[PDB]
Amino acid sequence: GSHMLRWKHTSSLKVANEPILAFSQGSPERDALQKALKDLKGQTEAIPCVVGDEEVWTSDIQYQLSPFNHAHKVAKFCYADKALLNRAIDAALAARKEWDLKPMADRAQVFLKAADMLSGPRRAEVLAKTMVGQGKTVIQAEIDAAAELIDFFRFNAKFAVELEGEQPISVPPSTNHTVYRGLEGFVAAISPFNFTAIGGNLAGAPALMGNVVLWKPSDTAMLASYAVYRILREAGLPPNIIQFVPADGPTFGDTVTSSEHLCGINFTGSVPTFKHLWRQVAQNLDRFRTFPRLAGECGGKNFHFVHSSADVDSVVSGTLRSAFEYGGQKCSACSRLYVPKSLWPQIKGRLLEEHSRIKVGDPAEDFGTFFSAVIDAKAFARIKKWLEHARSSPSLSILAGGQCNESVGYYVEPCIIESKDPQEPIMKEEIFGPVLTVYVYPDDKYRETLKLVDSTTSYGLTGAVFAQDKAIVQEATRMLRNAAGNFYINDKSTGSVVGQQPFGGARASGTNDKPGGPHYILRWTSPQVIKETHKPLGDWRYSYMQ
Amino acid sequence: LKVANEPILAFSQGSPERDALQKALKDLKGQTEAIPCVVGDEEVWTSDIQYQLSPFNHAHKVAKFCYADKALLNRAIDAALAARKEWDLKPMADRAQVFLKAADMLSGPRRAEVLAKTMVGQGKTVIQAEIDAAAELIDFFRFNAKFAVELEGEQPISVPPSTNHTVYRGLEGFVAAISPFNFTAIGGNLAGAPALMGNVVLWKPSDTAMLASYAVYRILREAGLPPNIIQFVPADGPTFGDTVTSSEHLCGINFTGSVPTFKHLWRQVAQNLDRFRTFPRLAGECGGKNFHFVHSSADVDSVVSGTLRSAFEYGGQKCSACSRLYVPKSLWPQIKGRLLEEHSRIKVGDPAEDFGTFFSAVIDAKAFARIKKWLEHARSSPSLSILAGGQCNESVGYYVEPCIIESKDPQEPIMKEEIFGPVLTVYVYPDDKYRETLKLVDSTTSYGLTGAVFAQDKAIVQEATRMLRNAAGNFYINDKSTGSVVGQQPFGGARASGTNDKPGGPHYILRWTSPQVIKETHKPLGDWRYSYMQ
Ligand SMILES: N[C@@H](CCC(=O)O)C(=O)O
Ligand SMILES: N[C@@H](CCC(=O)O)C(=O)O
Known part of the structure; x- marks a missing residue:
C-alpha cells in the first residue's frame, strides 16, 4: 500500500x-x-x-x-x-x-x-x-x-x-x-x-x-x-x-x-x-x-458622514486629507461630506481656515507642498468642467478654491463646494480631482439623511462616519453596510493598509x-x-x- | 465547529x-x-x-x-x-x-x-x-x-x-x-x-x-x-x-x-x-468527458470494477462518469473478457421493486432519445464496434442497457462528446506508445473535469500525474472517476x-x-x- x-x-x-x-x-x-x-x-x-x-x-x-x-x-x-x-x-x-x-x-x-x-x-x-x-x-x-x-x-x-x-x-x-x-x-x-x-x-x-x-x-x-x-x-x-x-x-x-x-x-x-x-x-x-x-x-463617490456628536477637529483634518491628498485622485477619496446643521458653522469655519493654509506646488522642489498638479490634460479639462458647473448650477456655491492654471503643470487648487441639493450630479459623479462637495442636513433628519448617503450614488467603495455616540455608530454601521466595502469609524476614507x-x-x-x-x-x-x-x-x- | x-x-x-x-x-x-x-x-x-x-x-x-x-x-x-x-x-x-x-x-x-x-x-x-x-x-x-x-x-x-x-x-x-x-x-x-x-x-x-x-x-x-x-x-x-x-x-x-x-x-x-x-x-x-487511463502495471480487477461503476452507475448520468477508457494492448484480452462477462450480469430494472438492480432507466424521453442517437452512431461508424449492450426500450421506462464500444479512432466524436448515458468507449493503445497516448488523453477533448490513472509503478504514476495536471480537476490514482466526497x-x-x-x-x-x-x-x-x- x-x-x-x-x-x-x-x-x-x-x-x-x-x-x-x-x-x-x-x-x-x-x-x-x-x-x-x-x-x-x-x-x-x-x-x-x-x-x-x-x-x-x-x-x-x-x-x-x-x-x-x-x-x-x-x-x-x-x-x-x-x-x-x-x-x-x-x-x-x-x-x-x-x-x-x-x-x-x-x-x-x-x-x-x-x-x-x-x-x-x-x-x-x-x-x-x-x-x-x-x-x-x-x-x-x-x-x-x-x-x-x-x-x-x-x-x-x-x-x-x-x-x-x-x-x-x-x-x-x-x-x-x-x-x-x-x-x-x-x-x-x-x-x-x-x-x-x-x-x-x-x-x-x-x-x-x-x-x-x-x-x-x-x-x-x-x-x-x-x-x-x-x-x-x-x-x-x-x-x-x-x-x-x-x-x-x-x-x-x-x-x-x-x-x-x-x-x-x-x-x-x-x-x-x-x-x-x-x-x-x-x-x-x-x-x-x-x-x-x-x-x-x-471608482467610488465616497462619503464622510458627520453626526452631531463628532469630534470637529478630526472631521476637518480627516476630510481635508481624504478629499485633497494626491489631488483627490483616489478611488477612495472623500468627495461628499454630510454635515449636521448644528456643527456646520464650526466645521465650515475650520475647513475654510485650514484650506487657506494648503500649499499646492512642485512636490520635488518644495516638500512643504500638500498636494500637486493632477495627472494630465484630460483630467485637468474634466475637473475644469466641473468647476464651471459649480458656478453655473443654482444649487452649488464655491466656498473655497475654484482656481486652476495649466500653464506649467496641471494645477487645480483644492475646491470646497456646498450643494443645497443632495441629488445634484456633483454629489453622484466621480470627478477624480480635488473637489469636495458639502451637503448640510438638519440634525432632526439624520436617519433620513443616512438613507440618502446609501442611495444617492451608484458606488460602494469607501465611507466614514464621524460620531462619538455608540448607538449612532452602531445604527450608521448597520444602515451603510452596503454603501462601503471599506468603512471607517472616526477615521478618513483613504489609506487602506x-x-x-x-x-x-x-x-x-x-x-x-x-x-x-x-x-x-x-x-x-x-x-x-x-x-x-x-x-x-x-x-x-x-x-x-x- | x-x-x-x-x-x-x-x-x-x-x-x-x-x-x-x-x-x-x-x-x-x-x-x-x-x-x-x-x-x-x-x-x-x-x-x-x-x-x-x-x-x-x-x-x-x-x-x-x-x-x-x-x-x-x-x-x-x-x-x-x-x-x-x-x-x-x-x-x-x-x-x-x-x-x-x-x-x-x-x-x-x-x-x-x-x-x-x-x-x-x-x-x-x-x-x-x-x-x-x-x-x-x-x-x-x-x-x-x-x-x-x-x-x-x-x-x-x-x-x-x-x-x-x-x-x-x-x-x-x-x-x-x-x-x-x-x-x-x-x-x-x-x-x-x-x-x-x-x-x-x-x-x-x-x-x-x-x-x-x-x-x-x-x-x-x-x-x-x-x-x-x-x-x-x-x-x-x-x-x-x-x-x-x-x-x-x-x-x-x-x-x-x-x-x-x-x-x-x-x-x-x-x-x-x-x-x-x-x-x-x-x-x-x-460537463466532462472523463477518462480512465490504464497502464500495463494496473490491477486488472480494480480497473474492471472501478470502470463498470464509473461508466454505468446511475446510468452514466454524472458529470464525473468515465466515458473513455484507454487500455494497453498487453492487458486488453483480460480487460475485454472481464468487462464483457461482468456486463452480462448487470441488472437494469426497477430499483424500488428489485434491490438487485445495478442501475435503472435514464431520466427522461429527451435523454433516452439523445443516447439512442449515440448508439445509432456507434452502429454506423466504421471505427466503432459495439462489444456488448446497445439495446434500449422506452415502452415502460426509459431503459438503456449498459453499452461497451471499442473505437479504433482515439479522436472519434464519441471519444469527445458528453453522452450522459451508460455508454463506455474503449481505445486500445500499443504498449510502446504509452506516452503518446497520455498526450492524447490530455489533448482529445474540450473538458477538464475528472479522470483516473490505474498503475502500480511509481514513476509512471508521477509522470502521468504531471502530464494530466490540467486534464482533470478531480484526478484519481487507482480509483474510479466518480464519487467525490x-x-x-x-x-x-x-x-x-x-x-x-x-x-x-x-x-x-x-x-x-x-x-x-x-x-x-x-x-x-x-x-x-x-x-x-x-
Ligand atoms: N486602496 C487605496 C485606494 C486605491 C485606489 O485609489 O484605487 C486607499 O484606500 O486609499
Ligand atoms: N461530484 C459528483 C458528480 C456531480 C455531477 O455529476 O454533477 C461525483 O464526483 O461523482
Missing part, C-alpha cells in the same frame, strides 16, 4: 507591514530621495516593451509628462502592436508550464527579494519616479511605491505559501491532496495611473500563483511601473512570466480578448472600460479554452476581490484535487444488492 | 434503514404530490401545469407542479429582496443552525423519505440515493456550516489606535440557483450555500427532480429557514433565465447543468451589465467543465460573500500636515 505520490510539508512565513519612514531633516531616506529626485531632473528614460528578455521598440512612440511640469517628458515609451502582443502571449504560454510546476515557495522568493530591494536600495528610486512621473508628494509616494507595494509582495507571498497547507481530509484507504494550479492560459493585467503599487500587485499576484501575465501599465505611470518591472526581473522573475507591454487600451483589450488562451483579466480603472472588457469576453466566449476570470476594482484593511467594494465599484487580504490570491488559482487509493477495489456490486 | 462525514449505511437485510426505506418506497407507490411554487409562505399555482414522471415507470406521475411565470418570478424577487437585510444581519452561527438542523433531520427521521423520493423520481438505486440525498447533502450542510463559522474567524491585523474587523456580507441583490436532475444534493447546495452566507435565492429546481427537491425545500423551512430566503420557483428554463438576467437586482447565478446554457446566461448578464446594481457573480459546474475531494474542473469553484471544499462559500472591512480609530486624528513638510 505504498504511497506513489509523496507530499512535502508546507512551511510558514513571518511578515509584518513595512514601516513608513519619516523623511525628517538630515535623515538618510530624505537625503537619498533628494538625490534620486535630482537624478531625474531633466531626464527622459526611453522605456521599451519587454517580451522575454528582449527590449522591443515599435514606431508608436508615446511620452509620459511630469504632471507639475509638463514640459518635462519623464519617459519616452511605445505601444506594443497587435503582432507584438500576440508574440508576447505565445512566449508566455510556452513558459507557463515550468513556472506553474515550480514550488510555491520558489515563486514567493522572487517577490520577497523584490520587496527587500524596494524597502532598501531601490526605495528612493521608486519614490522619486512616482513623485516626478505621477505628481505625488513624498508621503504619498512613500505609502504607495514603497509601503503598499512591499506589503502586497510580502503578504501575498505569506498567503500563498500558507494556502498550500489548506488540505482536505484523508480517510483510509485513500490520500487526498489539493494542488493549487495556476490558471491554464495567460492573464492580462491592466493597471491605473494613481498607484504604483496597484500595477505591481495586478501583475505580481497572478504571477505568484503560477500564472503568466501580459502587463499593460498606465501611460501616466510608466516611469515608476518600469522601475518595478526591472526590480522583479532582477529579483529572479524568469523571462516570459510577466511581459511588459504598454499599449493602446482598446488595442490591448481587443487582442487579449481575441485569444483562445485568455484565462483572466486583472483590471483596475474606469467602470466603462471594465464593462467593455467583460462584454468582449462574453462575445468571444465560444473561442476560449476555459471561462476567463475577470477581476475589476473601479495591506493586511489591516483589505480593500475593495461592490455596487458599481467592482468585483470586490479584496486585494490586501488573504483571499485575493484564490482568484488566480484553479485547484486540482488528487485522490490516491492504496488498496485494490472490490467487486462492482454492493452488499445490499444480494 | 467540529464536523465529520455522514456514514454511508449498508442497508443489510433487517437493518433499520432498509426497513425504513422499504416503507418509504411503499408510501410513494402510486402517489402523485401536487407541488406548488412557494414565495414566502404562499403556495402559488399557475395554469402552466407540468408533471414529473418516474423514469423506470413513466406512466407513474410522481409529481404535478407548475411553472412560475415572469410575473410570479418578479414578485418572488421583490419579496426576497425585502427579507434580505434582516437575514444578512443575522449572526453567521444563527444561519448555520438552520443547516445543521436540516442535516440532522436528513440523517435520521427524513432519510428514508429523501432517498425514496430520489429513487422513484430520479430513478436512482438505493446506494445512489444514499450517497446523494443523504450523505452528500448532509455533508454540504454540515461542512459549509463549519467553513462559514470558521470564516468569521479570519480577521485582519489591528494596530493601535485602530481596530479592524471583516464583516462577511452576503451579496447585495438576489442569487438565482439553477439545479440539475442528477443529484438531489446539488440542488440543496446550490440554493443552500448562498443562503447560508446571507443571500436570498430564487431556486429553480430541475423538473425531473422536483419531488426530492421539494422535500429538501420543506426540510429547510421546517429546520427554521425564514420565509423569502429561498423561493421555490420551478419554471421554464429560458423564461427563468430571461427574467432573472433582466432584474437590476441580480447579484449571482449558481448554476449546474449544460455548457451551452451556462454560456447563454453569461452572455445575457453581459448584455445587461448596465442595468445591474453590481456585477453579478456566475458559478457554473458543467465532501471535505475529502472538493469537486470541479476547468477547461470547458466550468468555473471550478470547488464546492465540497472550504473556499466555495467565498463566492457568496462580498466582504466589508471596518476600521475604527479610537483617538482623535490630529493635524492634516505631515512632519516632513515643516
